[PDB]
Structures are given as C-alpha cells and as structure tokens.
Design an enzyme around this catalytic site. Structure first.
Site, mmCIF file in Angstrom:
data_model
loop_
_atom_site.group_PDB
_atom_site.id
_atom_site.type_symbol
_atom_site.label_atom_id
_atom_site.label_comp_id
_atom_site.label_asym_id
_atom_site.label_seq_id
_atom_site.Cartn_x
_atom_site.Cartn_y
_atom_site.Cartn_z
ATOM 1 N N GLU A 55 0.841 -1.192 0.000
ATOM 2 C CA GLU A 55 0.000 0.000 0.000
ATOM 3 C C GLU A 55 0.885 1.253 0.000
ATOM 4 O OE1 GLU A 55 -3.414 0.572 2.897
ATOM 5 O OE2 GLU A 55 -1.736 1.569 3.944
ATOM 6 N N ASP A 230 -5.818 -4.298 -3.769
ATOM 7 C CA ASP A 230 -6.071 -2.855 -3.865
ATOM 8 C C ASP A 230 -4.790 -2.046 -4.117
ATOM 9 O OD1 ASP A 230 -5.230 -3.342 -1.175
ATOM 10 O OD2 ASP A 230 -6.349 -1.607 -0.438
HETATM 11 C C1 LIG Z 1 -13.228 8.584 23.938
HETATM 12 O O1 LIG Z 1 -12.729 7.365 23.335
HETATM 13 C C2 LIG Z 1 -12.029 7.515 22.143
HETATM 14 O O2 LIG Z 1 -12.937 7.969 21.131
HETATM 15 C C3 LIG Z 1 -12.231 8.369 19.942
HETATM 16 C C4 LIG Z 1 -13.251 8.993 18.996
HETATM 17 O O3 LIG Z 1 -12.617 9.644 17.898
HETATM 18 C C5 LIG Z 1 -11.462 7.170 19.343
HETATM 19 O O4 LIG Z 1 -10.584 7.674 18.315
HETATM 20 C C6 LIG Z 1 -10.649 7.110 17.048
HETATM 21 O O5 LIG Z 1 -10.006 5.829 17.093
HETATM 22 C C7 LIG Z 1 -10.100 5.117 15.840
HETATM 23 C C8 LIG Z 1 -9.457 3.748 16.079
HETATM 24 O O6 LIG Z 1 -8.228 3.866 16.797
HETATM 25 C C9 LIG Z 1 -9.427 5.926 14.688
HETATM 26 S S1 LIG Z 1 -9.739 5.083 12.987
HETATM 27 C C10 LIG Z 1 -8.175 4.199 12.418
HETATM 28 O O7 LIG Z 1 -7.456 5.078 11.540
HETATM 29 C C11 LIG Z 1 -6.274 4.492 10.988
HETATM 30 C C12 LIG Z 1 -5.601 5.578 10.151
HETATM 31 O O8 LIG Z 1 -6.469 6.080 9.149
HETATM 32 C C13 LIG Z 1 -6.634 3.242 10.187
HETATM 33 O O9 LIG Z 1 -5.433 2.629 9.728
HETATM 34 C C14 LIG Z 1 -5.369 2.339 8.379
HETATM 35 O O10 LIG Z 1 -6.231 1.223 8.108
HETATM 36 C C15 LIG Z 1 -6.202 0.831 6.722
HETATM 37 C C16 LIG Z 1 -7.291 -0.223 6.513
HETATM 38 O O11 LIG Z 1 -6.977 -1.432 7.191
HETATM 39 C C17 LIG Z 1 -4.786 0.384 6.354
HETATM 40 O O12 LIG Z 1 -4.749 -0.044 4.998
HETATM 41 C C18 LIG Z 1 -3.824 1.569 6.586
HETATM 42 O O13 LIG Z 1 -2.490 1.187 6.330
HETATM 43 C C19 LIG Z 1 -3.930 2.023 8.034
HETATM 44 O O14 LIG Z 1 -3.149 3.195 8.242
HETATM 45 C C20 LIG Z 1 -7.387 2.242 11.044
HETATM 46 O O15 LIG Z 1 -7.848 1.155 10.252
HETATM 47 C C21 LIG Z 1 -8.569 2.906 11.673
HETATM 48 O O16 LIG Z 1 -9.185 1.982 12.558
HETATM 49 C C22 LIG Z 1 -9.986 7.381 14.674
HETATM 50 O O17 LIG Z 1 -9.258 8.188 13.747
HETATM 51 C C23 LIG Z 1 -9.929 8.020 16.057
HETATM 52 O O18 LIG Z 1 -10.560 9.305 16.026
HETATM 53 C C24 LIG Z 1 -10.601 6.437 20.404
HETATM 54 O O19 LIG Z 1 -10.132 5.195 19.876
HETATM 55 C C25 LIG Z 1 -11.370 6.202 21.716
HETATM 56 O O20 LIG Z 1 -10.469 5.773 22.734
#
Ligand SMILES: CO[C@@H]1O[C@H](CO)[C@@H](O[C@@H]2O[C@H](CO)[C@@H](S[C@@H]3O[C@H](CO)[C@@H](O[C@@H]4O[C@H](CO)[C@@H](O)[C@H](O)[C@H]4O)[C@H](O)[C@H]3O)[C@H](O)[C@H]2O)[C@H](O)[C@H]1O
Ligand SMILES: CO[C@@H]1O[C@H](CO)[C@@H](O[C@@H]2O[C@H](CO)[C@@H](S[C@@H]3O[C@H](CO)[C@@H](O[C@@H]4O[C@H](CO)[C@@H](O)[C@H](O)[C@H]4O)[C@H](O)[C@H]3O)[C@H](O)[C@H]2O)[C@H](O)[C@H]1O
Ligand code: CA
Length: 629
Positions: A55, A230
């Site tokens: 990727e 992908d």
């Molecule tokens: C109060 O509790 C907290 O609430 C907040 C609300 O915002 C929570 O924060 C959110 O946590 C989410 C999970 O940790 C992330 S989404 C996360 O983003 C990354 C980066 O974009 C993704 O990684 C990518 O995934 C792709 C698909 O598999 C890969 O191809 C790529 O290489 C990766 O980089 C990942 O998949 C997602 O799950 C929110 O951004 C964040 O606001 C918090 O967790 C609570 O504790």
C-alpha cells in the site's frame, strides 16, 4: 506541454514532496523503502511502524508520478518501480521456478476450512473437498515464459526488526514476513508474525506452519506470499497518470509502464474464488471462468516447497467494495499502452469494469454511503447462505467482509479510497454509472463535513450499518436500497481520510461542476495546510483506543505447541501481544504509553503515516491541475 497549474497548490505539493523526501525526516529506510510511519510504536494493520506495505509502495509511486508532473523529472517514479521489484515482488530466489513450474492448474490447491475463532486453528487440509480449475495460468506462463507470479507481497519487515532475515538467514534486510492467518476474529493484536520463507529455523519444530494448517504428515519446508489487490491496482492507476504526464512533456516511463501492465495481468488471480468453486454454486468445482467473480477480492496467495518441488495458488471468495478500482480496470482494458500480453488480459479487465460498477451500485445505501461486500464462501467453508440474505450473482451480502475485529467496513477510509477511483473514471470518461453513484455519495458526504470557527474540522470516522441491500437483478438495477442504512458513530480529524476526501470531491467537482464539492475540497486542503502543518508534513494528536491490547490481549497458541521468536521470546499458551515482541519495550515511546495505561488514560500519539502524507501531497497536486485559476 502540460496545461498550467494553480501555483498556490502546486507549491504546497512541492513543499510536501520535500518534507517526505528529506533524509532528516526519516520516512525512508537506508535501502530507499518507505516505512508505514516515521514513528515505530504503531499498531493498526501492520503491527510495527517500520514494516512497509505494498500500500505504501503504491502511494510512493503516486507521489513520484505527481512530482514528475511538476518538475519534469520522472527518474524518481522509475526509482519507485525499481525498489518495488527488488524488494516487494518475490525474486527468482524467493519463489523458485523449480517449485512454481510444478504447479498443477487442474488442482491449484488443497481445501482447508476457515474458522470464526483463532482457537480453532490449525485448520485441517482435506484432499477430498473439490477444487476447481485455473483458466489463466497457461495464459501467463505462455506470455511471460515463467511460472513465477508478478505481484507484490503485501507486508515487509524493512529493517529486520523481527529477526527472520532473508530466506532464513536471520541477519539480512529486508525480511518477507506475514501476520494474519487465522480468520475474521484475528485482529492485528492476535497474530503470530511468521516468515514467508519457512525452513523451520525459527518458531517451533516445524517453524510456524503447524500453527495454521494441519496435514496428514510432517510439514515440508516452504515459502508462501499474499497479495493485497487494492495496492497492485493503485500501482497501475498511478503509473497511468505518470505515463500521461510524461508524454505531455516529451518524456517517457515506458519501462515502468511494462511492469505495471504485467502486474495488472497477474492481478487477475484476485478475480477467482479461493478454491475456484463456481460463483453462486459453491458446492461445485469450477471448470474455468465460471469461478471468476471478476471483482478485486481480498487477496490471491501462492507458495510452494523449498526442498521438494510443488506449488499452489488461491484466489479469494471475499469481496469488499473498498478494494475495487474501476479506473485501473478501465486503463487495462482500453488503453493500448497498458494492454496485457496475455490472450485474455484486456477482455477480462473489461468484464471486471462492468461487474465492479454493478457491485458499487448494489451496495449503495439509502443515504449514499457504500455497504461492505459479498462472499462466495459463507463462513469461509462454503456453507449454505441463510434464507433471507441478499445476493449479488449468487454471492451473499456480508456487512464486514473478511474482518470483524474491528469490522472491515466500520472505517470511513474505505469510502474515500474507493470512491476516489470512481471519481477518476467519471472525470476521464463521463461514464453514466459513475455519475449516478457519485451524485448520491457526494450529496451524503458533503452534509457530513463539519468546519469549526477556529479553523479545525471533522469528518466521519467510525460508521455502522443496519439492514442489507435488495437482491441484485441486473435488468432492474438500483432499487434505492430503502432498507440499507449507514450511521455515523463518531467524527474525527483523520488527515489521510480528509485528503482522500478532498481528492474525490475535486475530481467529481471538476467533471460535474458541483460548486459545493469544489469549495469543500478546497476548504479541507486549506484547513490542513494552515492548521495542521509541522516540520515533517502534517499531523494531529489522536487517541489510540486499542493500545491497552499491547498488555492485555492474549494470543492463542495451540495446546502443547512451544517455540521461540528469533530474539528468544517464548511462544506458548498464555502469552500476550507484548510477550512475543519484547523489543517493543525499547521503543522511545514505550514508557510514555505504559504510563498512560497505568493512569487509566487513553494513550495519544502524533503520527506521520506515509500514505497519509502522500495522500495530502497528491490531493494538493490534483487540485492545482483541475482548478488552474
Ligand atoms: C473517547 O474514546 C475515544 O474515542 C475516539 C473517537 O474519535 C477514538 O478515536 C478514534 O479511534 C479510531 C481507532 O483507533 C481511529 S480510525 C483508524 O485510523 C487508521 C488511520 O487512518 C486506520 O489505519 C489504516 O487502516 C487501513 C485499513 O486497514 C490500512 O490499509 C492503513 O495502512 C492504516 O493506516 C485504522 O484502520 C482505523 O481503525 C480514529 O481516527 C480516532 O478518532 C478512540 O479510539 C477512543 O479511545
Ligand atoms: C487475509 O489473510 C489471508 O488469510 C487467508 C485465510 O485462508 C490465508 O490463506 C491461507 O494461506 C496459507 C499460507 O499463508 C495457506 S497454507 C498451505 O496451503 C497449501 C495449499 O492448500 C498447502 O499445499 C499443499 O501442501 C501439501 C504438502 O504439504 C501438498 O501435498 C499439496 O499438494 C499442496 O497443495 C500447504 O501445505 C499449506 O501450508 C492456506 O492454504 C490458505 O488458506 C492467507 O495466507 C492470508 O494472507
Ligand atoms: Ca479477536
């Protein structure tokens, strides 16, 4: 000459390009390979910041192509292809043709069931279950003169952090490794990292093989690789633009075009059911193309013996809309410069384009967001589809294809990465199908972008679903899917997703003339530049809600199985994530993370993901080209 570009946004691309390529910023290894992120304490898909993915390589290609567009220098783009071929596509030494040439197209592999819980592995191989015929191998060996496959293995331990080395030597870098092996419930926190080349030198008595599959005799020394469709399709998409931009300037990337074209030819393996079973009639072995769903499935994998000659190849029965790429399919099936050498390469890609667009439409919710996907193998064991489950060409709808921890379709990112490709297709061809999809999707997302008075913003982060699409009838078409709904669970400021969103809205606005889409794209780009810039690109502070799993996630190890990781870590029942990766305690961020967990706080991080930085840079480039004035 290339048309003039908006100087403000071109400068932003150039500034970002400099920060990404700056040796002092540390985005690349000494071998010139980009890391998943500058920061090492990183678990999300790969489980270490300094492992790279196909990727990342495909984003590296996209970045260099855009740089070629503005500087007129395409040597950087050709370089991204050289690094890819040298380090991510298994060489003659990595996938011995002596073994690959023993492949049997009439018995591609041996069936093994998939389980919904990691504790059910190793999965037993069963030679009595039917397996269909592979219709494309003869096309590929005839066109290319080899049995080796030309595609990228998806993950690479760049600096040999795990210690497996190259082909079991324990010291060379980079090192081919794989992680996911045990089904839908095996998150990134529940894997046992293993080498792609297994000579039984590390792990247990038979290396790591018997943790995953069980056969009747003793496990043979063997290699195995897994493609991420992908990424290979994005590489083709990126190379097409590099070809177009180079020709507008009297330059050429002919040699890279040939590599992308060969990669697109082998990429067709993702069009087939895992064990080549007929699409829509899973209990029956396929006779060839009746086993092709023509979508970019979750993977295609291959392997064979190290000390004895034999090999296998499998496609994938699971399809997710987030992996599709109608643009790459359009390029490979219509552009003469990208016509695959194989006999059926171009025509197969033509069939995939039509099928992919039907798939997107079938999955479009009442609101506009695109739902998960479908599978030709219910529960990963070709079980009967429950009565009442919707289907697409006989394949049952699945809300979260392949992964459930967390659901593969609960991340907003899949929406933008995939729809961006639909927007590129629409921009280039004005295709009516792409138009209908985008008009509705864009209206949905434009109502979900929140701009704050202080310059910051929010976009959907985690989403959820209710219902299912109506059964697809190709002659009726889109019914509106009144009973399929998307729900936004929470918003956030994911800079990579926001950049991909700006990119999608820019292509769409350029073609449709939708002002709402154009100003939102620019507002997103401006807000990120002005409020999130830092010396390494862009970043923000985010909460890492799953990091508690570093210490509390138990990893399943079969009863009686014991082994050791290269650094001496003991693998046995009861180990936690950290127990088999003790080098993580030496990370500069380790004490900070543990201190937060101890105080009952959610750890936070300021991350520089390579793909996100490139996404932002490319998004500025695209805006500069499509809106010159
Ligand atoms: C109060 O509790 C907290 O609430 C907040 C609300 O915002 C929570 O924060 C959110 O946590 C989410 C999970 O940790 C992330 S989404 C996360 O983003 C990354 C980066 O974009 C993704 O990684 C990518 O995934 C792709 C698909 O598999 C890969 O191809 C790529 O290489 C990766 O980089 C990942 O998949 C997602 O799950 C929110 O951004 C964040 O606001 C918090 O967790 C609570 O504790
Ligand atoms: C999402 O990640 C992917 O998940 C899937 C889940 O299924 C993973 O697929 C599995 O990959 C495994 C390797 O990574 C292979 S194990 C391998 O299978 C082959 C083919 O069946 C076996 O070959 C047979 O070997 C015998 C000798 O030992 C021969 O006599 C026989 O003729 C050969 O066919 C081999 O022995 C096994 O070790 C799983 O088959 C596959 O499901 C995927 O890897 C993840 O990336
Ligand atoms: Ca789990």
């Amino acid at each position: 000459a290339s048309s003039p570009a908006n100087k403000v946004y071109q400068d932003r691309f150039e500034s970002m390009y400099s920060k990404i390529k700056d040796p002092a910023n540390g985005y690349f290894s000494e071998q010139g390979i980009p890391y998943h992120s500058i920061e090492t304490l990183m678990v999300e898909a790969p489980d270490y910041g300094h492992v790279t993915t196909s990727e990342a390589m495909s984003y590296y290609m996209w970045l260099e192509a855009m740089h070629g567009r503005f500087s007129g220098d395409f040597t950087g783009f050709d370089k991204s292809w050289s690094v890819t071929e040298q380090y991510l596509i298994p060489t003659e030494k990595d996938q011995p043709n002596t073994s690959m040439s023993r492949y049997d197209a009439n018995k591609p592999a041996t069936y093994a069931p998939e389980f919904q819980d990691p504790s059910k592995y190793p999965s037993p191989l069963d030679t009595s279950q039917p397996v269909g015929r592979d219709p494309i191998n003869s096309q590929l060996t005839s066109a290319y003169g080899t049995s080796m496959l030309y595609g990228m293995h998806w993950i690479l331990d760049v600096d040999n952090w795990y210690g497996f080395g190259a082909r079991a030597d324990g010291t060379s870098k980079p090192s081919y490794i794989n992680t996911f092996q045990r089904g839908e419930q095996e998150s990134t926190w529940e894997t046992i990292p293993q080498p792609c080349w297994d000579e039984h030198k590390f792990g247990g008595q038979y290396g790591f093989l018997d943790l995953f599959t069980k056969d009747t005799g003793t496990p043979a020394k063997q290699f195995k690789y897994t493609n991420a469709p992908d990424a290979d399709a994005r590489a083709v998409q990126a190379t097409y633009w590099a070809d177009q931009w180079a020709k507008e300037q009297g330059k050429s990337v002919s040699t890279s075009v040939g590599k992308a074209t060969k990669m697109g030819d082998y990429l067709r393996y993702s069009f087939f059911d895992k064990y080549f079973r007929k699409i829509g009639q899973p209990s029956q072995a396929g006779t060839g193309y009746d086993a092709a769903h023509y979508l970019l499935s979750w993977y295609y994998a291959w392997g064979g013996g190290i000390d004895s000659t034999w090999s296998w190849i499998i496609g994938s029965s699971h399809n997710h809309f987030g992996y599709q790429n109608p643009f790459a399919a359009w390029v490979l099936s219509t552009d003469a410069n990208f016509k695959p050498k194989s006999s059926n390469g171009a025509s197969d890609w033509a069939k995939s384009l039509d099928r992919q667009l039907e798939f997107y439409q079938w999955l479009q919710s009442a609101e506009g967001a695109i739902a998960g996907g479908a599978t030709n193998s219910w529960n990963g064991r070709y079980e009967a589809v429950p009565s009442g489950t919707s289907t697409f060409y006989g394949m049952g709808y699945v809300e979260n294809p392949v992964y459930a921890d967390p659901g593969s379709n609960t991340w907003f990112g899949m929406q933008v990465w995939s729809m961006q490709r639909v927007a590129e297709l629409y921009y280039k061809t004005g295709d009516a199908r792409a138009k209908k999809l985008l008009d509705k999707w864009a209206k949905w997302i434009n109502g979900e972008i929140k701009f704050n008075a202080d310059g910051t913003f929010q976009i959907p982060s985690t989403i959820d679903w209710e219902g299912q699409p109506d059964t697809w009838n190709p002659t009726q078409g889109y019914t509106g899917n009144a009973n399929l709904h998307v729900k936004v669970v929470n918003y956030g400021t994911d800079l990579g997703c926001a950049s991909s969103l700006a990119n999608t809205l820019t292509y769409y606005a350029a073609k449709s003339g939708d002002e709402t889409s154009r100003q939102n794209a620019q507002k997103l780009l401006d807000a990120m530049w002005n409020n999130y810039s830092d010396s390494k690109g862009i970043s923000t502070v985010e909460q890492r809600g799953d990091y508690h799993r570093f210490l509390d996630q138990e990893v399943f190890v079969p009863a009686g199985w014991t082994g050791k990781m290269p650094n001496g870590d003991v693998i046995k029942s009861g180990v936690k994530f950290i127990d088999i990766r003790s080098k993580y305690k030496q990370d500069p961020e380790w004490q900070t993370m543990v201190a937060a967990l101890q105080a009952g706080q959610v750890p936070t991080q300021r991350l520089h993901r390579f793909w996100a930085q490139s996404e932002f840079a490319v998004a500025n480039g695209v805006y500069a080209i499509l809106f010159p004035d």
